[PDB]
Amino acid sequence: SGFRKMAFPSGKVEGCMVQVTCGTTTLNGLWLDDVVYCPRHVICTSEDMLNPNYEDLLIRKSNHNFLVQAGNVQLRVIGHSMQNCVLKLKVDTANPKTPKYKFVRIQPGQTFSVLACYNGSPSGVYQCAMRPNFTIKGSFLNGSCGSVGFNIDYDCVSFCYMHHMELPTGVHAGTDLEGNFYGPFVDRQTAQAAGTDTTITVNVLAWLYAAVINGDRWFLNRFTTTLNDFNLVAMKYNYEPLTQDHVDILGPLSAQTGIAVLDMCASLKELLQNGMNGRTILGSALLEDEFTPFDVVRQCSGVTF
Amino acid sequence: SGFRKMAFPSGKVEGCMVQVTCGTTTLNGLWLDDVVYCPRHVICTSEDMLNPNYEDLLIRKSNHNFLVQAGNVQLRVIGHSMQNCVLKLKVDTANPKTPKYKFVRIQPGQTFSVLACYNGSPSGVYQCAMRPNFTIKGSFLNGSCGSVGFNIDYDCVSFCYMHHMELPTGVHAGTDLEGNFYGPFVDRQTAQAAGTDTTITVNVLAWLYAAVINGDRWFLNRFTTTLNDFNLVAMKYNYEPLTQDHVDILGPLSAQTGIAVLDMCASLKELLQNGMNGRTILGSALLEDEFTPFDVVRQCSGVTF
Numbered sequence: 203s204g205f206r207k208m209a210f211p212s213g214k215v216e217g218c219m220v221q222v223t224c225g226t227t228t229l230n231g232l233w234l235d236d237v238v239y240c241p242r243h244v245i246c247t248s249e250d251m252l253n254p255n256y257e258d259l260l261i262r263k264s265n266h267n268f269l270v271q272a273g274n275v276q277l278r279v280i281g282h283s284m285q286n287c288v289l290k291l292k293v294d295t296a297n298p299k300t301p302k303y304k305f306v307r308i309q310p311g312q313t314f315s316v317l318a319c320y321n322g323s324p325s326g327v328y329q330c331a332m333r334p335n336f337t338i339k340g341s342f343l344n345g346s347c348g349s350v351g352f353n354i355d356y357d358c359v360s361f362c363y364m365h366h367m368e369l370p371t372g373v374h375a376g377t378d379l380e381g382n383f384y385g386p387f388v389d390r391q392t393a394q395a396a397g398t399d400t401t402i403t404v405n406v407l408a409w410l411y412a413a414v415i416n417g418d419r420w421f422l423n424r425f426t427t428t429l430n431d432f433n434l435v436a437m438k439y440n441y442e443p444l445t446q447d448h449v450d451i452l453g454p455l456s457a458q459t460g461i462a463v464l465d466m467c468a469s470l471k472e473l474l475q476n477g478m479n480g481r482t483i484l485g486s487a488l489l490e491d492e493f494t495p496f497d498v499v500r501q502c503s504g505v506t507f
Numbered sequence: 508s509g510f511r512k513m514a515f516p517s518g519k520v521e522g523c524m525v526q527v528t529c530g531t532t533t534l535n536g537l538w539l540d541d542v543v544y545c546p547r548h549v550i551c552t553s554e555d556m557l558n559p560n561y562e563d564l565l566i567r568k569s570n571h572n573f574l575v576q577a578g579n580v581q582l583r584v585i586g587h588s589m590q591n592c593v594l595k596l597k598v599d600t601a602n603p604k605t606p607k608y609k610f611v612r613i614q615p616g617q618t619f620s621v622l623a624c625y626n627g628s629p630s631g632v633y634q635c636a637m638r639p640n641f642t643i644k645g646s647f648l649n650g651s652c653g654s655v656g657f658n659i660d661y662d663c664v665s666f667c668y669m670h671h672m673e674l675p676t677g678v679h680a681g682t683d684l685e686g687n688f689y690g691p692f693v694d695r696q697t698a699q700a701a702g703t704d705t706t707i708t709v710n711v712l713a714w715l716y717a718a719v720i721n722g723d724r725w726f727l728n729r730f731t732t733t734l735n736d737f738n739l740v741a742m743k744y745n746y747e748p749l750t751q752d753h754v755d756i757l758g759p760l761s762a763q764t765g766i767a768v769l770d771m772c773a774s775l776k777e778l779l780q781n782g783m784n785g786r787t788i789l790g791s792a793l794l795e796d797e798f799t800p801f802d803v804v805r806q807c808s809g810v811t812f
């Protein structure tokens with residue numbers, strides 16, 4: 203019992219973090235096999251970051267200008283390429299701690315753990331979601347760039363996120379591990395609009411199932427609704443529209459609890475229209491949208507890595 | 508920018524977790540040097556757990572009845588002793604992954620990371636506090652016993668908590684690593700009263716400093732108060748009384764922000780008396796008490812391990 207925002211155990215990723223320096227910029231990189239991945243903005247000075255010409259800046263650079271360090275272990279860089287907004291530094295040693303891993307581009311609403319790092323060392327680990335508008339609400343200071351987000355499935359690490367920037371509004375943007383930003387962001391210091399954010403409706407519902415499982419049940423009511431009627435209320439409260447695919451993903455939670463999805467929707471409706479009346483659910487006075495249905499099942503059934 | 512509930516990176520602890528089986532009970536143990544530590548209730552059957560005579564149960568046991576496994580690696584048990592509510596299994600191999608570590612008994616209000624484990628494998632990591640009443644509000648299923656709580660200071664792991672039980676009320680109790688429970692709890696399945704819990708006032712204040720640092724400043728007001736006047740309001744809202752030691756620990760945050768402790772206290776007062784008016788602070792609609800002043804400084808200044 204209890205329900206917590208829980209990160210994956212981070213040890214498989216801790217052994218892949220390195221420090222990358224170029225000129226006087228230092229940030230973090232990820233060492234997998236004989237390739238180090240890092241944000242291409244490692245090659246930018248202070249000048250350059252309002253309007254960087256990344257092709258031209260990188261031409262000024264040679265393999266020996268990339269100082270890559272793992273612990274005290276210096277690595278030797280024998281190749282460099284830029285893919286989209288990441289740099290790939292070929293080194294002469296395969297990381298002996300490389301886990302089984304793949305690179306995945308996640309969908310808005312999906313969750314992952316972030317290992318926040320400075321100077322190639324881990325400071326902490328936390329779980330968060332890719333917002334509908336492709337930002338993340340992290341905790342990241344100068345020097346945290348190249349910190350990665352990941353999921354773990356037994357022994358397989360799925361890397362989904364590399365951190366690149368803080369927007370003027372205090373939220374965070376970054377790339378997948380092929381260097382394609384999530385969202386409309388670019389790697390320059392400019393005004394950039396994040397969309398309107400929405401609440402992740404399907405995640406909220408999963409979390410209400412988690413609450414019932416744990417004995418928090420006050421919000422359950424004698425009402426039902428329809429998809430279309432629920433969607434009209436989702437509208438007004440800036441919630442993502444709910445689809446049958448979402449209903450279907452909620453099925454195993456529906457079956458465990460005996461509470462039909464559309465009845466849970468009617469509960470949510472009533473919370474959205476009436477607020478929470480100064481009550482809490484699972485220790486929160488807000489509706490929480492950073493657990494997926496997969497997350498709730500994993501936690502409520504005690505899956506290991 | 509951003510402020511998150513962040514756990515320590517868990518890799519140093521992941522390499523110490525094992526599985527311990529005795530009869531048909533399996534839980535988790537912690538392998539450090541040539542000693543495995545685990546909850547003594549591993550030797551209990553279903554019968555025994557209403558009223559266990561631990562001395563007599565353990566006498567029925569020999570070294571070879573303790574099956575200790577690390578990965579597929581079986582360990583050989585060459586000695587067993589019970590200290591308070593933990594069992595110490597002497598094994599014939601020193602853990603090659605043993606970090607620098609000590610055992611510490613933390614104070615109510617202090618925080619630590621928990622690596623929740625099943626069958627000696629890590630499922631996840633989360634930060635929490637030792638409540639004033641010596642419980643913790645974890646996320647723990649059957650099989651999670653022996654999961655540990657810890658802090659990290661560079662390369663030194665401080666183990667402070669081993670999980671032993673869930674109370675009938677759904678909160679969690681356990682021991683330090685010498686097997687002394689925190690609080691009045693015992694390791695039997697019985698009605699057990701946790702005290703009245705209090706909010707950790709000094710942690711709330713630290714978190715208000717964190718909010719100001721991050722730009723959430725709406726709650727700041729044109730009032731001040733005194734310790735005694737603040738303490739009268741702490742009373743009524745079941746907040747821990749605030750002492751000069753608490754003021755003094757808040758000093759570096761006071762100095763960074765320019766906001767005198769007692770003025771921050773007057774802000775808190777006004778929040779306690781008026782509630783939050785449907786506003787949020789650092790994404791929360793409640794006052795958060797699971798960051799220490801040390802935690803806020805660490806996060807806001809980007810300390811690594």
Ligand SMILES: *C(=S)NCc1cccnc1
Pocket residue numbers: 228229342343344345346347348366367368374508
């Ligand atoms: C990273 S090394 N620099 C950009 C940055 C700064 C603050 C937060 N996130 C990204």
Ligand SMILES: *C(=S)NCc1cccnc1
Pocket residue numbers: 203533534647648649650651652653671672673679
């Ligand atoms: C641990 S192996 N058994 C007791 C328990 C059960 C549920 C939660 N926490 C502790």
Ligand code: NA
Pocket residue numbers: 241242243244287288366389
């Ligand atoms: Na970049």
Ligand code: NA
Pocket residue numbers: 330331332333337338339340
């Ligand atoms: Na987020």
Ligand code: NA
Pocket residue numbers: 336337338374375376377383384385387
């Ligand atoms: Na992004």
Ligand code: NA
Pocket residue numbers: 243251366367389390391
């Ligand atoms: Na940038």
Ligand code: NA
Pocket residue numbers: 546547548549592593671694
């Ligand atoms: Na015990």
Ligand code: NA
Pocket residue numbers: 635636637638642643644645
């Ligand atoms: Na707690």
Ligand code: NA
Pocket residue numbers: 641642643679680681682688689690692
């Ligand atoms: Na306890």
Ligand code: NA
Pocket residue numbers: 548556671672694695696
């Ligand atoms: Na017990």
